[PDB]
Specification:
Layout lengths: L11 H5 L19 E2 L30 H12 L6 E4 L2 E2 L5 H12 L5 E2 L2 E2 L10 H11 L7 H11 L12 H17 L5
Parallel strand pairs: 2-4, 3-5
Antiparallel strand pairs: 1-2
Helix pairs in contact: 3-4, 4-6
The chain binds zinc ion.
Length: about 190
């Protein structure tokens, strides 16, 4: 009873149902879906088991300031990513990553680039002009931050929650953020207005 078996009833339909961004930015987690790149190949078969879930903030020396995403940044170096095999990573998170990660993921994925990163975010963290930059440089090259809407939803739902009796979730409100959130990716990616 996990991500390949089944999550919890009050997990997605409870929190992921008409609830953009977690009640409290913490314990972020992204599910990974990767293909196999064989110097021209791209095995996009049924490949997806989930990913890491790390948080930046804390209350001790452990406070490093790195999220599942930066955790993903670590998956590559261990993955033997590219040097051994290029995979098309497509992670599904509850929301954006962070500007700080924008620089981290960028340097490795953007400034370097040799792997695919698709981080689905139900809602771009918008407090006072933050996060927007995170996906900006990332979605631009350090990590393609996609919008977690109805489409990414059906995929998200079954990403962790097999179904437990429910094929796909509707949400609806995510459609609103679809035009908004997505419109932002295009507005932040290249500092575009509309
Ligand atoms: Zn981050």
């Amino acid at each position: 009873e996990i991500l390949r078996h089944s999550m919890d009833p009050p997990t997605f339909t409870f929190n992921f149902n008409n609830e953009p961004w977690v009640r409290g930015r913490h314990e972020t987690y992204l599910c990974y879906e990767v293909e196999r790149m064989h110097n021209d190949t791209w095995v996009k078969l049924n490949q997806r088991r989930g990913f890491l879930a790390n948080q930046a903030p804390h209350k001790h020396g452990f406070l490093e300031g790195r999220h599942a995403e930066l955790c993903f940044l670590d998956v590559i170096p261990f993955w033997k990513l590219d040097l051994d095999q290029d995979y098309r990573v497509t992670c599904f998170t509850s929301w954006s990553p962070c500007f700080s990660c924008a620089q981290e993921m960028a340097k490795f994925i953007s400034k370097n680039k040799h792997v695919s990163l698709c981080i689905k975010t139900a809602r771009i963290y918008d407090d006072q002009g933050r996060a927007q930059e995170g996906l900006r440089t990332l979605a631009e090259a350090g990590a393609k931050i996609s919008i977690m809407t109805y489409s990414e939803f059906k995929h998200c739902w079954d990403t962790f929650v097999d179904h437990q009796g429910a094929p796909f979730q509707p949400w609806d409100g995510l459609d609103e953020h679809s035009q908004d959130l997505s419109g932002r990716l295009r507005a932040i990616l290249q500092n575009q207005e509309n």
